[PDB]
Design a protein around this ligand. Structure first.
Ligand SMILES: CN[C@@H]1CCc2c(ccc(O)c2O)[C@H]1O
Lengths: 50, 271, 330, 282
């Protein structure tokens, strides 16, 4: 019933190729990797938990 | 700020005292889950363990609507039909807290097909699975077969690997009435009943042999699933409770005591 | 009848296949690996009576709220290992809890169909949201007055606390919705149902913009990349998958032959490099989002884990298992 | 060239007892999943076994092999007090564990409310206090010293420290250490066996047509009885009749009782959780 209309509405969506999305996501990850306390361990004195 | 730390410590101490009291209360009281097919008369056991007129008339309206979908002349035909309906003789989780002698208990009454919330209940001492023993003839796979499949699904669950099952069979009078009449014989729907025979060891109430054979066949069919799985941390206690039986609460008390005893005996490498 | 829907689904699959040019691993294979990661238990939070089913960090990245089957919703101060508020609950069972970004309100709803929020500023209920059917799975706060709740009836709903009624209803899931996540801009949110399908909804429009059904088992967790254009779903099947919103299809699959247990919670890191995912095998795994290679295993829980959470500042990740004891893992 | 083998055997026994007790204690303490009211009693037993193995076993071996107590007269009384305290604590902790099992099985619903962490700590403190009262008090203030002409010179001398006590202490201390726990544990395990047999009969009656308790109870009771009862009956006998009992028999039975302490951890820590903890630790 309404599922056909829902799929028809969802069909008309612009798509970005996987290469561009992956490149953008990798660029974001590289840019914001510096401010990641889990990725790079924080100094003990500045660490709130120790 | 030392004052802030002192205030936080005082609040922590007060909350810890309240939490210790709550933990003692929680450990004091056991927990049971009441799982039923809905048409198995789980409400009768709930009443047995522990506006109104309009609601009863409203239930008659659902039966009346079902009869028309499937008045005095057609009323007789409606009863012979096999469909989901309330009792014709008359015409949202629920928590029940009861205390057996010197002990605290607390019942869980869940209100579907996926049953993804079953993993939530793992601290309960037992599952009070209630199934109508006279529902073999009604069909939707027969309803009794569906209940057996649900029992198998509950029994062989990874999360429920240490939870026993208390099994009740209501409609014993109904089962006897349907067996003695001869309409909808067990062999018609359950082919194994022809080969099945009454077990050598049995304690039947002063009942016709056919009723005893049918009841014990249903009990054995339910017990086969329980016995197939691995022994230990799993035990099923079948019961043959009637529609009006006031001894059900003592039966569940004894069953829970045996559950705790057998858990402790399996521990310590005794049993 | 259904032939048109089948043709539309086939066309959607063909379009998604046509969009794929180079896989994520094909492009990210040249980036340096994150390397071995060792995380120690910075703090342990004991005293909580029963198995925790969910938790949520505070917007200040310091306070957190945890709920268990014991009916206790205790708010913890993670820095000092101190519990500030203990909130008794009318319903014994709680499947989720939420902490508002303002911090004034804490949401808590479970197997009871009614969802209730608490006004921290003793503690008392504000408006027990009851216009719902079935149990709840997860709740989040868009603001101090609008809360979106999951459902056991496959109907995610949006609430207005002052009005107390569902502003809008979301439908389209075959199975019950088990988890959901909100965007940094709060414009859109996704929800992973039990029908192995993850759907993205538009808050204003009220209709699902896309639909992702790459899994095979019930989906039990979902969270966003910090970018907001990609969400990762953790299913009952051992595989954890990362989807995309612009590409409108799956990008990477996380799975190992050694692991066969389910997944109960998935949470990204501050930079999104590490995808921390819990498991039913008493341990929490840390995956590399890009290379799809495991970079360490977190443990220390007697029973299965159920929830995860990373502070807004990214200082540490918290885990609450069925062993009735949370842990903070810096 | 014959004493060296006995010394090697004694060193091996001491090392085994120390290693087992240390492993049990560190397994109980380190992991929070193993902390339990009964596991506190197991921890107390392990601590008593560790103290015994690290204190009295090597000194006893040195006394036996060299036949000369090099250390002072005062320190030997302290060693005897430590020995009595350790033995009494171990036996009474075994009795307490048996009582805990009886209260867990016979009265299941009341067991959770009866035993708590505070209750377990109080019970352990009381049992250690009574063991101390039985051991340290009668020894330090010299009530246990004999009155006959024999061993009075041994008391005066520094080298000789052979055990010689009154006919009174050798009976009362023996009773308190072993005989009351023996009767209590026998009654406990009789009740537990009866309950297990009843449960097995119920299983057979209900789920029919589809000896572990005896073996485990036999192990638990037999190890303790065979390793301690002969020593304590000899303890009574030599005071009653000093002609029959020789020193070598006394020492041999006492050391069998000693090695019972090292045998205890491998029979009271056989749970699968303890095995998993042992595997994870090593
Ligand atoms: C010299 N060794 C002592 C002598 C008497 C004695 C021992 C242990 C427990 C007791 O209750 C005792 O009375 C032995 O370990």
């Amino acid at each position: 019933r309404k599922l056909v209309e829902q799929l028809k509405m969802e069909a008309n969506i612009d798509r970005i190729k996987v290469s561009k999305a992956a490149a953008d996501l990798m660029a974001y990850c590289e840019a914001h990797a510096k401010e990641d306390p889990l990725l790079t361990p924080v100094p003990a004195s500045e660490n709130p938990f120790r | 700020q030392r004052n802030e730390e002192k205030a936080q410590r005082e609040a922590n101490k007060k909350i810890e005292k309240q939490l210790q009291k709550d933990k003692q209360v929680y450990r004091a009281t056991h927990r049971l889950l009441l799982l039923g097919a809905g048409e198995s008369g789980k409400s009768t056991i709930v009443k047995q363990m522990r506006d109104i007129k309009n609601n009863l008339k409203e239930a008659i309206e659902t039966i009346v609507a079902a009869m028309s979908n499937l008045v005095r002349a057609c009323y007789e035909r409606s009863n012979e039909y096999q469909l989901i309906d309330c009792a014709q003789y008359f015409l949202g989780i629920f928590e029940t807290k009861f205390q057996v002698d010197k002990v605290n208990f607390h019942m869980f009454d869940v209100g579907d097909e996926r049953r993804k919330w079953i993993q939530c209940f793992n601290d309960v001492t037992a599952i009070i699975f209630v199934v109508a023993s006279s529902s073999y003839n009604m069909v939707i796979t027969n309803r009794l077969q569906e209940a057996l499949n649900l029992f198998k699904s509950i029994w062989n669950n990874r999360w429920l690997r240490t939870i026993s099952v208390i099994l009740f069979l209501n409609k014993q009078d109904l089962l006897a009435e349907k067996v003695l009449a001869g309409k909808s014989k067990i062999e018609d729907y359950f082919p194994e009943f022809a080969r099945y025979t009454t077990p050598e060891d049995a304690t039947p109430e002063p009942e016709d042999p056919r009723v005893t054979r049918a009841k014990y066949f249903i009990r054995d069919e339910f017990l086969r699933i329980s016995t197939a799985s691995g022994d230990g941390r799993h035990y099923c206690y079948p019961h043959f409770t009637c529609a009006v039986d006031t001894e059900n609460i003592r039966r569940v008390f004894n069953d829970c005591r045996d559950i705790i005893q057998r858990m402790h005996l399996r521990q310590y490498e005794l049993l | 009848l259904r032939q048109e829907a089948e043709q539309l689904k086939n066309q959607i699959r063909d379009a998604r296949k046509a969009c794929a040019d180079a896989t994520l691993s094909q492009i990210t294979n040249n980036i340096d690996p994150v390397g071995r990661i060792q995380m120690r238990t910075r703090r342990t939070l004991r005293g909580h009576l029963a198995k925790i089913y969910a938790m949520h960090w505070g917007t200040d990245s310091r306070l957190l709220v945890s709920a268990s089957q014991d009916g206790k919703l205790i708010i913890w101060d993670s820095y000092t290992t101190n519990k500030v508020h203990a909130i008794p609950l009318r319903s014994s069972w709680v499947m989720t809890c939420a902490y508002a970004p303002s911090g004034n309100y804490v949401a808590c709803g479970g197997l009871d169909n009614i969802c209730s929020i608490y006004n921290l500023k003793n503690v008392r209920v504000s408006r027990e949201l009851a216009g719902h059917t079935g149990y709840l799975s997860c709740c989040r706060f868009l603001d101090d007055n609008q809360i979106v709740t999951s459902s056991g009836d496959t109907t995610c709903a949006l609430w207005d606390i002052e009005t107390g009624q569902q502003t809008t209803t979301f439908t389209g899931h075959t199975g019950d919705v088990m988890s959901l996540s909100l965007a940094p801009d709060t414009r859109l949110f996704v929800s992973g149902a039990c029908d192995a399908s993850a759907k993205l909804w538009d808050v204003r429009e009220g209709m699902c913009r896309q639909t992702f059904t790459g899994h095979e088992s019930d989906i039990n967790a979902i969270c966003f990349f910090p970018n907001g254009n990609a969400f990762a779903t953790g299913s009952d099947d051992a595989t954890c998958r990362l989807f995309d919103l612009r590409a409108d299809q799956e990008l990477m699959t996380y799975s190992h032959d050694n692991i066969i247990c389910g997944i109960t919670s998935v949470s990204f890191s501050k930079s999104g490099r590490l995808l921390l995912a819990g498991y039913d095998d008493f341990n929490c795994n840390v995956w590399d989002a890009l290379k799809a290679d495991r970079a360490g295993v977190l443990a220390g829980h007697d029973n299965r884990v159920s929830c995860l959470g990373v502070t807004d500042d990214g200082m540490a990740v918290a885990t609450g298992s069925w062993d009735s004891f949370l842990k903070i893992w810096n | 060239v014959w004493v060296v083998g006995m010394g090697i055997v004694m060193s091996l026994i001491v090392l085994a007892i120390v290693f087992g007790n240390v492993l049990v204690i560190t397994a109980i303490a380190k992991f929070e999943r193993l902390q339990t009211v009964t596991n506190y009693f197991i921890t107390s037993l392990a601590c008593a076994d560790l103290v015994m193995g690290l204190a009295v076993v090597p000194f006893g071996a040195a006394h036996i092999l060299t036949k000369t107590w090099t250390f002072g007269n005062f320190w030997c009384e302290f060693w005897t007090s430590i020995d009595v305290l350790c033995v009494t604590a171990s036996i009474e902790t075994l009795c307490v564990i048996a009582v805990d099992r009886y209260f867990a099985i016979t009265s299941p619903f009341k067991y959770q409310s009866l035993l708590t962490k505070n209750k377990a700590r109080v019970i352990i403190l009381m049992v250690w206090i009574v063991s101390g009262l039985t051991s340290f008090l009668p020894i330090q203030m010299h009530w246990y010293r004999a009155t006959h002409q024999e061993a009075i010179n041994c008391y005066a001398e520094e080298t000789c420290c052979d055990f010689f006590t009154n006919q009174a202490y050798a009976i009362a201390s023996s009773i308190v250490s072993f005989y009351v726990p023996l009767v209590i544990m026998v009654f406990v395990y009789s009740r537990v066996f009866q309950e297990a047999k009843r449960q097995l009969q119920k299983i057979d009656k209900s789920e029919g047509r589809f000896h572990k308790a005896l073996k485990t109870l036999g192990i638990i009771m037999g190890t303790f009885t065979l390793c301690w009862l002969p020593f304590f009956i000899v303890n009574i006998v030599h005071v009653i009749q000093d002609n029959l009992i020789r020193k070598e028999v006394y020492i041999l039975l006492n050391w069998i009782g000693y090695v019972n302490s090292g045998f205890n951890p491998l029979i009271y820590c056989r749970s699968p959780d303890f095995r998993i903890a042992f595997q994870e630790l090593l």
